Amino acid sequence: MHRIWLMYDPRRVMVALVGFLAVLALVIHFVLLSSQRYSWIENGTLGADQAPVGASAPAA
Amino acid sequence: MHRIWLMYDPRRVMVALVGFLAVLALVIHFVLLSSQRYSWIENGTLGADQAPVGASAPAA
Amino acid sequence: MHRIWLMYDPRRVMVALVGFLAVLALVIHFVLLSSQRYSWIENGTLGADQAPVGASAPAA
Amino acid sequence: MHRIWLMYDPRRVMVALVGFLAVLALVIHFVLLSSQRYSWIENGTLGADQAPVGASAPAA
Amino acid sequence: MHRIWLMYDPRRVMVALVGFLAVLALVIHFVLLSSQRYSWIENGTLGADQAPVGASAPAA
Amino acid sequence: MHRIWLMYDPRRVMVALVGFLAVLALVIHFVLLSSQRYSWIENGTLGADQAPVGASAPAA
Amino acid sequence: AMLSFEKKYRVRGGTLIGGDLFDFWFGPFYVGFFGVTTIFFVTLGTLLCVWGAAMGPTWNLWQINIAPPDLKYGLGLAPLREGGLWQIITLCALGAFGSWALRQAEIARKLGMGMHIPWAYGGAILAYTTLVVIRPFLLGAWGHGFPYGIFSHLDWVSNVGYQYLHFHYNPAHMIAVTFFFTNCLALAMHGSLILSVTNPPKGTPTGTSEQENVFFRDLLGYSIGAIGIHRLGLFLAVGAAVWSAICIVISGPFWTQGWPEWWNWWLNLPIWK
Amino acid sequence: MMEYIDGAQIALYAFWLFFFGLIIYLRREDKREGYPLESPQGPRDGWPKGAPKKTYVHRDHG
Amino acid sequence: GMTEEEARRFHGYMVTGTLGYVVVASVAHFLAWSWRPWF
Amino acid sequence: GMTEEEARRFHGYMVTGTLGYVVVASVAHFLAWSWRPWF
Amino acid sequence: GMTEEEARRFHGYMVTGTLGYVVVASVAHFLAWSWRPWF
Amino acid sequence: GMTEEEARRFHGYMVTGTLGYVVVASVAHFLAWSWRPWF
Amino acid sequence: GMTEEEARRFHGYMVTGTLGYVVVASVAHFLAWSWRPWF
Amino acid sequence: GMTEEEARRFHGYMVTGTLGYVVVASVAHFLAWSWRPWF
Amino acid sequence: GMTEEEARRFHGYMVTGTLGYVVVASVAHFLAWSWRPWF
Amino acid sequence: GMTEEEARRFHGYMVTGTLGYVVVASVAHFLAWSWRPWF
Amino acid sequence: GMTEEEARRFHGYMVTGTLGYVVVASVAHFLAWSWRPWF
Amino acid sequence: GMTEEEARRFHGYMVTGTLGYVVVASVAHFLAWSWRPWF
Amino acid sequence: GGMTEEEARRFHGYMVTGTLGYVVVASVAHFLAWSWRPWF
Amino acid sequence: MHRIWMGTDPHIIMSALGSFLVGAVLVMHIWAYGQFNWPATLKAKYATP
Amino acid sequence: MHRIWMGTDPHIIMSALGSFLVGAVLVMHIWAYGQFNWPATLKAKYATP
Amino acid sequence: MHRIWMGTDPHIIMSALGSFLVGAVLVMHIWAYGQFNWPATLKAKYATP
Amino acid sequence: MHRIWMGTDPHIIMSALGSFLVGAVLVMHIWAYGQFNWPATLKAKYATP
């Protein structure tokens, strides 16, 4: 596996990895922050039985 | 089959593969997250019989 | 038949073929997913007798 | 662990780190200040049970 | 810790620090001056009991 | 303390300082002149008991 | 501070006005007589903008709005709180922009350069002068100028366009837009080409004018060449501003109807009337 | 459920952080020639410090 | 460029790859047909 | 470039990594199917 | 680049950091799950 | 560039300063939680 | 650059200026607090 | 640049002038406060 | 790749593993049939 | 990688550990079956 | 990394620590069961 | 890093410090238990 | 760089003494606080 | 049978097997908690009414 | 059995094992508090009406 | 057992240990103050009707 | 035990320790004022109706 560090410079890879993780974490956090279920700054204290849930009915 | 890698630089193949898989994975997750049935962030706690379903052919 | 690979470099043709198949597959999935009958992400669980069918001749 | 500082120049990493922490702190403070629950400059004197809370799941 | 001044030229760090503190101070003053509770040029003479407070969560 | 002038050319510091103080003073005068309470060109002859004060919090 | 090669260039001479009197630098900046008049007008205009913000309803940067006078004041100066301030700021702006172009001419003369940069900037000054001087003068009131405010001037642009119902149909505007879009395309190609020969893939030799010329010729079918692409970029960028000046000066002073009905002449050509 | 924060605003600050990063990078590239500056107080670098001067490999013969 | 025997070796894998792909696609189509016929 | 025996060694890792990834993805689909079947 | 020695010892820290990161993330998910399940 | 002994001396300051910062931030969350818990 | 004795000397002023600044800011905050508390 | 003796001489003017300016400004605030207090 | 000698050893173990797997599955099916017959 | 000699030691432990895992798993199932029979 | 002599010595501590940990945990579960039986 | 001579000597204080810490906490828990027993 | 063995020896003795004094004074303060307003 | 190991690194073997065991065990337990109604019966036994 | 440690760094092992145990213990407690209704009964014993 | 310390800077060890304790102790006190209703009962003693 | 100080400057040690004590003591006092109703009972003695 370590031949990966011979194909690619670890100095270049580490920047790409941290860049990927930082973007991915920021994307996921703001997606949750934009939701109703997980908007934790406003509603984090609610407790799971009274946290919002998306509409059920396929019908009836 | 391994001689395919004599044609293509594996150092390029891995980047193209990761690029393809990342874009494909992101596309499919957002397609599902756009759907009614699989908006798991808002409605993931519904059971399978309570999740939305598309409209059947009319018979009413 | 193999002499086609003397006329055309297979390291080009393989990449062209993979690209063609990728775009073709993506188009056909997208056409089906947009349809009423085959919008499987929303209506996939419907039985074949319940799936939409497009109209008819209005033959009285 | 210390060999990271041979791969990267500590003069650059430390300025990158200071810049990152500066931006991140400002982002978190301004996100909080824009919220209802943690707009502390207007509402900081409210007790924890008086502070705004996001709306519950709908009940019917 | 004085060898931070061998990593970095103090003449440059002090200009950057003076710059940072000036911008930060002006930002915080302008945030407060934009607020209601701390609009001190208009309402500075009000008592602490009289200064604006942002609204609480409504009682059930 | 005087060795600060070995580090910085006083001829440049005095330029920076005069520039900073000039802009700061113009800022503070225009901020006050835009206020209701300290718009002294229109209202400077009013006594301090007569000068405007911003809105209190209402008591209930 | 000076660039490592700069000192031998810092000679006297080349001024238009003032001679040796202001022929000196301040940090990187060349001063000169038109530098002194630049700073005067910039300072006076900027502080009158801050005064305009102070007497307006907010310090919010996006919302500050120093508006021209009512049309009833015609070509006179209005009361300062009723749009006369916008008029004084406009004089400072004209003075600052003119001083900037003449200072550029003094700098270019000191370096033995051609006068291309001052005259290219003259294209932008022409558009500004059209918007606030020429078009309002032809309409007979300074109140036809646009307001000084980061978003309120976009409200003016919106409303002026809809004064002609469908401003896209303005024929000079179509040309001006085409120049702006063509300029941006040409700039992306010129930037890309120079960078791609000077920064080739690792281990490749530095490229050449011949490679640039060959590639460009596969893009457009013809070679533009080195001086040709800079002539083109200058023609496109300055022509965009000149056709902009034309498109706004014909809107109102010369054409008053909706712009779609201007195209009636094309429908009535005798070969197909 | 955040009322003030919305996706267009989030995107816009994402862009600003990229853009101010980009201006820094371009100002580093702009200093590959003529820097460090001469001054009566010795060399000066400005800010950011410039990227080093490039050396260009010529076409080996032709 | 390939030699003729180098090309004829490659051709064997290409045909096998194509047949494998068509087989997978056939099973997919037959699954899809049994789920929701299009004729 | 790359030698015959490097290309072979790389292939063994590549095949193992591809099939390993498909096995993890298969379990992900088994979990998804248990949670909310799409047919 | 670096030797195979250097690459192989770097890989040891890289794996260890990855494991540490996955561990913290796993605890974060179980805290999040017990606070507010998403299935 | 640093010698390894310089990197080792820097590393211990960098670790200590990071952990010191995290300790101060831990108190800041202790205070913020006491004033207005977010869960 | 600096010699380490110059770095040692400069640091003592820098720490004292930072302390003096933090002290003035501490009085400023306690004046502000007693005028109009923010918690 | 400057001699340290020249730095001492300038520092004398600089500190004195700075404090003189602050003294004039403190009187200006005394007058402004007497006319229209801001707290 | 694998020599004729290696292939001969490898085959004997592959046959052994396959038969072992089939034996275990034979017990599994006999148990399943006795629990819930499917024809 | 490994010699056959290293492989032959490793195989001995690998079989032993696998066997031990099965034995503990067998007790776990016997207890589970006693507690809640699933057929 | 570790020679066999380091590994042989390390293993004695690793095994002892693992045993000690399980002993403490066995007491913990005995007490927990006595307090609130879970089957 | 530390020699064995340092490591052996450091270990003795690290153990002694830990046992001091556990003893103090043991008294703390005995007092807390007598005050408010949590089982 | 930093304290030698014997500088550390001197420092530690004062460091121990200062810590002990601080704990002693805090012990007195807590006894006054307890007798003033007991908290258990 | 031991010659299957020869080309390998034993730390990769134990890493891969360990990852598989962790995965399979977690999947099995979370599945089993669904089917067997434990710990749900444990929770109900000590729940406050 | 000890030969498995050969070639490793003992600090790397103690980091990995330490990380795992902190994670495992924390998860097991967060889970156990949900199931056993403790400390919820503790809080109710001392809560003011 | 002392051989585990060899490669390590003792100041890093003491910094890591001390930081862990500060974190753990602060968490434990917030948690305990909530479960045990203290200082809340203390505050209720010395309060003005 | 004194050897822990070797390779450290006394001034960084006392700077950090003094900074810690200032922080800790201010936190404890502001906390304590909230619980013990002091100086609030002092204020109420001398307040004007």
Ligand SMILES: CCCCCCCCCCCCCC(=O)OC[C@H](COP(=O)(O)OCC(O)COP(=O)(O)OC[C@@H](COC(=O)CCCCCCCCCCCCC)OC(=O)CCCCCCCCCCCCC)OC(=O)CCCCCCCCCCCCC
């Ligand atoms: C969401 C909006 C999307 C919306 C959809 C948007 C899609 C846009 C895709 C654009 C991709 C551009 C990529 C590119 O230009 O690469 C340069 C290369 C030309 O350079 P070249 O030098 O001449 O190339 C030949 C060769 O010398 C290159 O060698 P190189 O060393 O540089 O490596 C490049 C290769 C690496 O090789 C491989 O990937 C092939 C390996 C084959 C292995 C076969 C398996 C055998 C072993 C078994 C185990 C194997 C284990 C793995 O990689 C590339 O760079 C190209 C990668 C494929 C690109 C696919 C493009 C489609 C992507 C679809 C994405 C859909 C969304 C997820 O040209 C191409 O790759 C052509 C791209 C394909 C175009 C096909 C034509 C489209 C026709 C459409 C008709 C549709 C209606 C019928």
Ligand SMILES: CCCCCCCCCCCCCC(=O)OC[C@H](COP(=O)(O)OCC(O)COP(=O)(O)OC[C@@H](COC(=O)CCCCCCCCCCCCC)OC(=O)CCCCCCCCCCCCC)OC(=O)CCCCCCCCCCCCC
């Ligand atoms: C809207 C989308 C498109 C918008 C498109 C906007 C594009 C704008 C691009 C141009 C902006 C940079 C201009 C520039 O580099 O001027 C040279 C000057 C000094 O460095 P130097 O030239 O390498 O070295 C000379 C100096 O060290 C010594 O010279 P000397 O001793 O002879 O003279 C005295 C010194 C005193 O220093 C100053 O006065 C500097 C004051 C700079 C204030 C303006 C900053 C604007 C930043 C805008 C970017 C963004 C800021 C947020 O040097 C001088 O006198 C130099 C005078 C330079 C005058 C430049 C005036 C430019 C005004 C531009 C206003 C643009 C408004 C949009 O540079 C600087 O002071 C630092 C500039 C750093 C680049 C900006 C990066 C900002 C990233 C975000 C914040 C980063 C925080 C760490």
Ligand code: BCL
């Ligand atoms: C080279 C010095 C070492 C160090 C050596 C010690 C020693 C020795 C002791 C502590 C102790 C403690 N350390 Mg430590 N500690 C270091 C770095 C840290 C860091 C960090 C972010 O880097 C943190 C959060 C801690 C945290 C802690 C606390 C858990 C505890 C007391 C408060 C304290 O230190 O406040 C923050 C203050 C600082 C970080 C400054 C440095 C430590 C100060 C000087 C300790 C003085 C008090 C001590 C008891 C005096 C010894 C004589 C006594 C009579 C026994 N240390 C540095 C790297 N630390 C004590 C303990 O174990 O209590 C249970 C203890 O005996």
Ligand SMILES: COC(C)(C)C/C=C/C(C)=C/C=C/C(C=O)=C/C=C/C(C)=C/C=C/C=C(C)/C=C/C=C(\C)CC/C=C(C)/C=C/C=C(\C)C(=O)O
């Ligand atoms: C609007 O209409 C809509 C709605 C869209 C409807 C209409 C749709 C229409 C019109 C569709 C048309 C479809 C079509 C038409 O032709 C489709 C044709 C498809 C074809 C041809 C598919 C072929 C696939 C072949 C594959 C995958 C081969 C893989 C090969 C592999 C893996 C081996 C690689 C080589 C190796 C390993 C050896 C190296 C050795 C070396 C190097 C050595 O030995 O040296």
Ligand SMILES: COC(C)(C)C/C=C/C(C)=C/C=C/C(C=O)=C/C=C/C(C)=C/C=C/C=C(C)/C=C/C=C(\C)CC/C=C(C)/C=C/C=C(\C)C(=O)O
């Ligand atoms: C909206 O919902 C949407 C978003 C749509 C849903 C979908 C989301 C999707 C698809 C997510 C996919 C995620 C993913 C997929 O793989 C995510 C992959 C994550 C991964 C792999 C993370 C890896 C982390 C690794 C870390 C942190 C390593 C740290 C290493 C350190 C610290 C040590 C460095 C080395 C040192 C110190 C030694 C130097 C020695 C040297 C130099 C020497 O010795 O020489």
Ligand SMILES: COC(C)(C)C/C=C/C(C)=C/C=C/C(C=O)=C/C=C/C(C)=C/C=C/C=C(C)/C=C/C=C(\C)CC/C=C(C)/C=C/C=C(\C)C(=O)O
């Ligand atoms: C939306 O959020 C919102 C609302 C915005 C809220 C959030 C705000 C946030 C995140 C704020 C963050 C603040 C912060 C974070 O670190 C702030 C950090 C601030 C800091 C570090 C301040 C430090 C100041 C130090 C000073 C002043 C030092 C002065 C030194 C002097 C005078 C001596 C100079 C030397 C001399 C004279 C000797 C020469 C000798 C020589 C040459 C010789 O001897 O040679």
Ligand SMILES: COC(C)(C)C/C=C/C(C)=C/C=C/C(C=O)=C/C=C/C(C)=C/C=C/C=C(C)/C=C/C=C(\C)CC/C=C(C)/C=C/C=C(\C)C(=O)O
């Ligand atoms: C539900 O509806 C639908 C789906 C339609 C229903 C229909 C389903 C259908 C049609 C199913 C078909 C299934 C099927 C076939 O037909 C399935 C076939 C299954 C098979 C074949 C299983 C084989 C297992 C073999 C094993 C486990 C071997 C293990 C070997 C081991 C352990 C030894 C390893 C090697 C060694 C030691 C040698 C190294 C020596 C070396 C290197 C040396 O000596 O050098």
Ligand SMILES: COC(C)(C)C/C=C/C(C)=C/C=C/C(C=O)=C/C=C/C(C)=C/C=C/C=C(C)/C=C/C=C(\C)CC/C=C(C)/C=C/C=C(\C)C(=O)O
């Ligand atoms: C929802 O219901 C669904 C999910 C659908 C239901 C279905 C589920 C299914 C189908 C499950 C299948 C599971 C399965 C199989 O198929 C599961 C297979 C499990 C297995 C194989 C476990 C094996 C464990 C082995 C262990 C623990 C070994 C430990 C060995 C040790 C410690 C020694 C290490 C080496 C040493 C010491 C030598 C060093 C080097 C030396 C000496 C040197 O180098 O010299």
Ligand SMILES: COC(C)(C)C/C=C/C(C)=C/C=C/C(C=O)=C/C=C/C(C)=C/C=C/C=C(C)/C=C/C=C(\C)CC/C=C(C)/C=C/C=C(\C)C(=O)O
């Ligand atoms: C609730 O629902 C779900 C979650 C599903 C429920 C299910 C949960 C499940 C499945 C749990 C499984 C848990 C598990 C396993 O499977 C758990 C396994 C735990 C283990 C292995 C613990 C081992 C601990 C070992 C320790 C503490 C050792 C310490 C050693 C020390 C201190 C000595 C230090 C010195 C050394 C070493 C060397 C010195 C010499 C040197 C250097 C020299 O000499 O050179």
Ligand SMILES: COC(C)(C)C/C=C/C(C)=C/C=C/C(C=O)=C/C=C/C(C)=C/C=C/C=C(C)/C=C/C=C(\C)CC/C=C(C)/C=C/C=C(\C)C(=O)O
């Ligand atoms: C409200 O809820 C929550 C917040 C949860 C509740 C709170 C909870 C907790 C957990 C609080 C924790 C507190 C704590 C620890 O645990 C607190 C620890 C405090 C400590 C360690 C105090 C130590 C003080 C030591 C002093 C003052 C030393 C002075 C030394 C002097 C003066 C000598 C200087 C040196 C000399 C003279 C030698 C020079 C010689 C030289 C140079 C030479 O000889 O060369």
Ligand SMILES: CCCCCCCCCCCCO[C@@H]1O[C@H](CO)[C@@H](O[C@H]2O[C@H](CO)[C@@H](O)[C@H](O)[C@H]2O)[C@H](O)[C@H]1O
């Ligand atoms: C609330 C604040 C909490 C503490 C904040 C963090 C800073 C603590 C500083 C005081 C404690 C001692 O902190 C310790 O300082 C010494 C030097 O003095 C540093 O030591 C550093 O330099 C010495 C030489 O001087 C090297 O031998 C050592 O390897 C290197 O790390 C340590 O890396 C740091 O851990």
Ligand SMILES: CCCCCCCCCCCCO[C@@H]1O[C@H](CO)[C@@H](O[C@H]2O[C@H](CO)[C@@H](O)[C@H](O)[C@H]2O)[C@H](O)[C@H]1O
């Ligand atoms: C890193 C160190 C600092 C980390 C700080 C970040 C928060 C960490 C919190 C972990 C502990 C949570 O601890 C939890 O606190 C809440 C606060 O509402 C307590 O809650 C209880 O006491 C508080 C006290 O004000 C009451 O307001 C509340 O109504 C009551 O339910 C819980 O009984 C306790 O279990």
